[PDB]
Design a binder for this molecule. Structure first.
Ligand SMILES: O=C1Cc2cc(Nc3ncnc(Cl)c3Cl)ccc2N1
Ligand SMILES: O=C1Cc2cc(Nc3ncnc(Cl)c3Cl)ccc2N1
Ligand SMILES: [Cl-]
Ligand SMILES: [Cl-]
Lengths: 124, 4, 124, 4
């Protein structure tokens, strides 16, 4: 086509989706990770995660308001990945890298799994 | 704005 | 903070939101523009438009499944702007620029209004 | 990935 493109549009959209999440606006699901609860938008979770994409395209699970993750999933690891979904920024640290990588593998977030593998390999 |  | 950032994350999220729109997945509103109907995600419309942001933060309108736009709004102009919201690409042409600019002013999409003004000024 |  002969379209023009606004370079900062995708980033501006993601920034506004994060502002709606912070104010709890039109969030339609709560993700339960052991004792912790995280409110989010189903569309953003699906757009970022192979696991959520599979869950919310399922004809019965698409209508659930609560999703319980596997008890082995660490709440902090999940929180870090949820923040990444909404911002593009990943808070990766020596103290959380193992939990972040395990959570990213479970959530099927291949680019996160890739950087965790590379950061771990460099420390070996 | 750019030509993509 | 000491975060790392994935450059293509926002663009990848927007691409997946557009794929969900194309397959009509988790769309929660229909925008009526005269005889034409457009299905979308309320969160994406709010993230892109000052008008939709105002509408869906309203305690009564946030729950509506149908929104009727002003009869002066051109369906093609709306379609072009909806495509822009979901892709960052604007199909701006001599034959549609007046309708696109009027629709962008109504929807409160200031960056679109700006490029339309500049493209019109250059032709004068 | 980059340092933002
Ligand atoms: O590493 C990742 C990140 C990811 C996201 C999604 N999401 C979607 N993919 C295709 N079309 C649609 Cl409509 C969506 Cl929402 C699926 C798989 C994976 N894997
Ligand atoms: O030209 C534009 C594009 C636009 C989008 C929105 N959206 C939001 N703004 C602030 N916080 C939130 Cl939560 C959202 Cl969703 C509001 C005004 C405008 N004007
Ligand atoms: Cl990823
Ligand atoms: Cl805009």
């Amino acid at each position: 086509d002969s379209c023009i493109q606004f370079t900062r549009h995708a980033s501006d959209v993601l920034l506004n989706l994060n502002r709606l999440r912070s104010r709890d606006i039109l969030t339609d699901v709560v993700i339960v990770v052991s004792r912790e609860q995280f409110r989010a938008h189903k569309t953003v979770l699906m757009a970022c995660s192979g696991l959520f994409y599979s869950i919310f395209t399922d004809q019965l699970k698409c209508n659930l308001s609560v999703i319980n993750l596997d008890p082995e999933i660490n709440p902090e690891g999940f929180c870090i990945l949820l923040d990444f979904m909404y911002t593009s920024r990943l808070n990766l640290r020596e103290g959380n890298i193992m939990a972040v990588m395990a959570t990213a593998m479970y959530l099927q977030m291949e680019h996160v799994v890739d950087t965790c593998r590379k950061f771990i390999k460099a420390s070996e | 704005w750019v030509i993509p």
